[PDB]
Amino acid sequence: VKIQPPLLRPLAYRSIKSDGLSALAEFVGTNIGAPATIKFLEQFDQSGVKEVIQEFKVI
Amino acid sequence: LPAHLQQTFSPEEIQFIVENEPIKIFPRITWQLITTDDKALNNMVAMRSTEVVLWIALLLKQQSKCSIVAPQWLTTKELDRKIQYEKTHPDRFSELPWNWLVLARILFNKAKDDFHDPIHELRGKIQDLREIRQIKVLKGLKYLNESHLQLDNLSLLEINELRPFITEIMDKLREIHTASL
């Protein structure tokens, strides 16, 4: 997947630590919009932010 | 990997190079860019000559905040004496500002309003002198052999476009010649 994190960062900015923002940017990075990325990011203590961002058979 | 040219510079790239040229202007005002090389200067008095790089003048002209002075060297009578000197000099390619081609192209885009009747006047002259220069290049070009190439005086643009030809040929000549030994 292709993204530009410098563009991503001011959007993420709207304080937040760089480690948390960078971590969520990396993890959410695989999921991409057209983009829809803004819609998923706006949905998102440190523990709550960290948990909120995360979101053998038979033939 | 752009691959183009890769030996020649793109025409727009040489235009990017000529962006660096300083030029005099007449601002409408009566700053402190930290970027790289301007370092100057305090708010300039209106209609007063001050030297500034080309692209910023292009900006100010786009906002019409400056009055560009026409370059003194570009005067029809001077091109007439140049063409005169050309008809009598089969070899020498004498004087050219060397960047003048792109300048004139740009100056006629916007700066056209300041000049006194350049319209249907110097435009023909520059074209005429241009082509006679091109053919004089061709006449000296028939003489081409290693190891000397007479580069004397020419605007960088034409030198760039003619580059692939001569550059790739001379190598063959040298190779076959030295190789024959």
Binding site: Q4, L7, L11, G33, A34, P35 | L1, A3, E12, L58
Partner: protein
């Protein structure tokens, strides 16, 4: 008739250059002919198997004759020739993909798997260098020098849509905007006029 398969493949490469000349660059390499490669392998395998055979027999019935060494020396060159053809072929074959890896990243299926393996590792490697700079580069795109500064672009089948502000991409709506965001959207083909 002998190194003939090499001639056909090298020739196809030569044509593929011209196929890519203007072109517009729509270049989608037709296929990897591995059947011909198999034929090369069968010929070399037969050749070096006989070569090793005579190399062994040289101590018994050939008795290391001077003329016998010539055929080894011949086949060795022929081998290099074959090699040379495949090397250059693949090198260009690789090169064109490399170019396609650069231009549109950015910011198939018919071709042989080894290429995609190399490709995925190549693109991962170039992303490693993009991570290194941290300059920023942005080295794969932005080939044309900018001016001045704003441009008018029209939408190309994009609706859509976000960087710095959400601009609400709307199909068939032309704007007047700075080069910056346009550079990103053009990589996806979403913008048309420049």
């Amino acid at each position: 008739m002998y190194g003939d398969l090499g001639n056909k493949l090298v020739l196809e490469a030569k044509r593929t250059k011209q196929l890519y000349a203007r072109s517009n660059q729509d270049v989608n390499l037709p296929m990897y002919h591995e059947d011909i490669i198999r034929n090369i392998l069968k010929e070399v395998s037969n050749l070096r198997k006989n070569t090793e055979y005579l190399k062994e027999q040289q101590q018994l019935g050939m008795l290391d004759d001077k003329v016998a060494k010539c055929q080894y020396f011949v086949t060795l060159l022929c081998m290099e020739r074959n090699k040379r053809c495949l090397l250059a072929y693949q090198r260009l074959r690789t090169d064109i993909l490399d170019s396609m890896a650069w231009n549109n990243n950015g910011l198939t299926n018919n071709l042989s798997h080894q290429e995609q393996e190399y490709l995925k590792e190549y693109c991962d490697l170039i992303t490693d260098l993009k991570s290194g700079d941290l300059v920023d580069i942005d080295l794969s795109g932005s080939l044309v020098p900018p001016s001045d500064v704003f441009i008018d672009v029209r939408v190309l089948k994009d609706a859509g849509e976000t960087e710095y502000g959400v601009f609400n991409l709307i199909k068939d709506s032309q704007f007047f905007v700075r080069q910056s965001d346009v550079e990103r959207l053009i990589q996806q083909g979403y913008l048309q006029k420049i």
